[PDB]
Design a protein around this ligand. Structure first.
Ligand SMILES: O=C(O)c1[nH]c(=O)[nH]c(=O)c1F
Ligand SMILES: O=C(O)c1[nH]c(=O)[nH]c(=O)c1F
Ligand SMILES: [Zn+2]
Ligand SMILES: [Zn+2]
Ligand SMILES: [Zn+2]
Ligand SMILES: [Zn+2]
Lengths: 362, 362
C-alpha cells in the first residue's frame, strides 16, 4: 500500500539559473525536486548575476516561470549596497537571505552594522533567513533582538548551534531553524570515502557528536531543507572545489528510512517538510497536490541520481527504504517511477497567487 | 483598506447539537463562526447524547452536514467504556477529547488508568486533546510520556499551567496548547460586573497575574480557540448556572484589538488561528477561502452578538478595534457586514476530503 503525503516544500535550494546552468537549471532542478517528492521550492539568490536588485529579480522570475516544473518562490539576497532599496519588490520574494559567513563578493557583508541596516529596512512582516555558523548564530540573533523581529537560521549543522537555538527558544525568542540531510546522515566518518573535494560543503560535515546532537534535539528543528547546492563532479574533484551537495532527489528517501526505523515519526517529518515551511514563509497551499510514497522497497543510492545535473551524490552506497512513486501537482501527474511528466514552465511563482501574498497591516 | 486573512480555524467549539439546540445548533453556531471570521470549526463531543460511540458520531455527522454553514470536524469523546472500541471510526474524527476534570457522568473518567487505556488504544497518529486544569496538566503529560506520544492541552488559563507547559517544551516533550480569549481579556476583576452566574466558566477566570502570565508567555501558546460554550441567559442567571461563555463572534475582534495595540503581531495571530491549528490537527486547506477584516473601525461589544443563540456575552462593554467585513468560503460569499449568505448544509466534514485524512504508516 502506498502512503499519501501532502505536497512537500523545500525552502532551501540552489537552482543555479541564471549563470551556472551547467550545474543545474530551473528545469533540471525542479525535475529533481519532483522526483524527491517536493512540489514547491524556495530558490536562493547567489546566482550569476545575484538576485540583489529589482532587475535581477525580474529576470529570475521569467527564467523560473519558463523553466520550473514545480511551484516556487525566489529569495532576494542582501548586499552591502541594497539595504533600503528593496521595499517595492520585497513582498514578491520568498524572503531576504543574508550570507553572513563565506560567500561571493557581491553578497558579502563586511560589518554587523550592515546586518542591522537590513533588519531595520526590510519590511518587518516578511521573512529573513541567514547562513550563520557557530558564533554567527548568536550574533545574528542579537541583531534580531535589537531590531525586535524574527530570524530563521539556515542549515543548522552543529551541536553548538542547535543548543544555542534551544536556549533562545526557551527564552521565548522568535527564532526558527532548518537542518539539511547531509548533517543528519553524514559526518566526519565519511570524509575518507568522499575525499576532500567531494566532501567540501558549508556548513562542513560535523562530528558524530554533532549528528547525534541534532537527532537528540529534533524538537528544536522546525524544518528540513536540502540546501541543494549542485556542482559537477569535475568541479567537486578539481583544483578549487566549490562547497555543496546535491540533495533534492535523496532527502525524502533518507528521511523515510529514518521514519521506518523509528528515529522520528511520519508526523515529525510532515511538520518539518510541509507545515512549518508553510507557516514560517507564509507559503500557500497547492490545490490537488500530493505525493505517493512506498515505504517497503529497499534500494541503494547510486553514484548519481537521475535528474540533477550535478551527476554525483555524497550519499552513494547508503541503503534506503522509501521511494517516491507518484507526484500529482495541481491535478496533473507530474512524476511517476522515474519519469517527469510536466514540462518546463508548468510551475508558478506562488507569491503571485492571491493566497501567496504575506498578510500585512495597512 | 481591508486586510485579507486566510480562513481561520477554531479547534474548540460547542455547537450543542444534538440535544441542546436551544443553546446553539450547527446552523446558528456556524453562522456565529463565519461572523467571527472563522471558516472551519472542531466541535466538542459533550452533546446529548455524547459523541462516545460510532452510532452517535454517525448521527452528529449527518446533523452537521445538514446544518453547518462552514466546514468542520467532529471530536470523539473518551468514556469509561469506549477505550479500544473506536478504532474503526477514529480516523473520521477531529481527534479524541478527554474530560479530565468536571464533566457529565457519561464522559467522566474515574481513574488515571482509564486515561492510560485511551492513550494506549487510540491510534497513535491521531490527535488527543484534554481538558486538564492545574495539576491535571502534569498528570496527563505523565500519561503521554508513559505511552510515548503527544497531547494537546485545551484552554490554558493559569500562570501555573503555561509555566508547566513551558518547562515541558524546554525538555523537548511533544505537547501543544491553546488559550481562549476570556482568559486573555477577562479576569477576577470582571466578576463583580458579570455576577456569579454569568461568570461561571471552566477553567474559571484567572487573576490579573494569570492573565499577565499568558501574555508574557505568548511564545508558549500554540493556538487560540474560543471554547465557544453557549448557554442561554436564563440558564446562566438561574439556580444552577452552567459554566461557559459564547465566544465565536468576539474572538477575532478582541485579538485584532490586541494586534492594533502592539500586544502581538498579525503573524502571531495567524500562526495561532490558522497555521498551528492546521498542523496539530492535520486539517486540510480550504480552497478559495479568505476573510477580509477592517482594523480602523472602533466599536463597543453589545449585550449580545447577532448570531449565537446564547444571546449574551461576557465581553459586553469592551471597546474593540477590528471588524469582520467579508468572508469568502469555497468561492462563495458566506458573510458580509452582518449577513450570513450561505445556507445550513453549505459546510462539509473536512475529514471526508482526501486531503483531510491523517497520514499514517501502512
Ligand atoms: O551555493 C553553493 O554552492 C553553497 N554551497 C554550500 O555548501 N554552502 C553555501 O552556503 C552555498 F551558498
Ligand atoms: O460544555 C460546556 O458548556 C463547557 N463549559 C465550560 O465552561 N467548560 C467545559 O469544559 C465545558 F465542557
Ligand atoms: Zn548556506
Ligand atoms: Zn544554501
Ligand atoms: Zn473544557
Ligand atoms: Zn470546551
Amino acid at each position: 500500500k502506498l502512503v499519501r503525503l501532502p505536497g512537500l516544500i523545500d525552502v532551501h535550494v540552489h537552482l543555479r539559473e541564471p549563470g551556472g546552468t551547467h550545474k543545474e537549471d530551473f528545469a533540471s532542478g525542479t525535475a529533481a525536486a519532483l522526483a524527491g517528492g517536493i512540489t514547491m521550492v524556495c530558490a536562493m539568490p547567489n546566482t550569476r548575476p545575484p538576485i540583489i536588485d529589482a532587475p535581477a529579480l525580474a529576470l529570475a522570475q521569467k527564467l523560473a516561470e519558463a523553466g520550473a516544473r514545480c511551484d516556487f518562490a525566489l529569495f532576494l539576497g542582501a548586499s552591502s549596497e541594497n539595504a533600503g532599496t528593496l521595499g517595492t519588490v520585497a513582498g514578491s520574494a520568498a524572503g531576504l537571505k543574508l550570507y553572513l559567513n563565506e560567500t561571493f563578493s557581491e553578497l558579502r557583508l563586511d560589518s554587523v552594522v550592515q546586518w542591522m541596516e537590513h533588519f531595520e529596512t526590510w519590511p518587518s512582516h516578511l521573512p529573513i533567513v541567514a547562513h550563520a555558523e557557530q558564533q554567527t548564530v548568536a550574533a545574528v540573533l542579537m541583531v534580531a533582538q535589537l531590531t525586535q523581529r524574527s530570524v530563521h537560521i539556515c542549515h543548522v549543522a552543529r551541536k553548538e548551534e542547535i543548543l544555542l537555538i534551544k536556549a533562545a527558544k526557551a527564552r521565548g525568542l522568535p527564532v526558527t531553524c532548518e537542518v539539511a540531510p547531509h548533517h543528519l546522515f553524514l559526518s566526519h566518518d565519511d570524509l575518507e570515502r568522499l575525499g576532500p573535494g567531494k566532501g567540501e560543503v558549508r556548513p562542513e560535515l560535523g562530528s558524530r557528536q554533532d549528528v547525534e546532537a541534532l537527532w537528540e534535539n529534533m524538537a528544536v528543528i522546525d524544518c528540513f531543507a536540502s540546501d541543494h547546492a549542485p556542482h559537477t563532479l569535475e568541479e567537486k574533484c578539481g583544483s578549487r572545489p566549490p562547497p555543496g551537495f546535491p540533495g533534492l532527489e535523496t532527502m525524502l528517501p533518507l528521511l523515510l528510512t529514518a521514519v521506518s526505523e523509528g528515529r522520528l515519526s511520519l508526523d515529525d517529518l510532515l511538520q518539518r517538510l510541509h507545515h512549518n515551511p508553510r507557516r514560517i514563509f507564509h507559503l500557500p497551499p497547492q490545490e490537488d497536490t500530493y505525493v505517493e510514497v512506498d515505504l517497503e522497497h529497499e534500494w541503494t543510492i547510486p553514484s548519481h541520481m537521475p535528474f540533477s545535473k550535478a551527476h554525483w551524490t555524497p550519499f552513494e552506497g547508503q541503503k534506503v527504504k522509501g521511494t517516491v512513486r507518484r507526484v500529482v501537482l495541481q491535478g496533473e501527474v507530474a512524476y511517476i517511477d522515474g519519469q517527469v511528466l510536466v514540462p518546463p514552465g508548468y510551475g508558478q511563482d506562488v507569491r503571485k497567487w492571491p493566497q501567496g501574498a504575506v498578510p500585512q497591516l495597512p
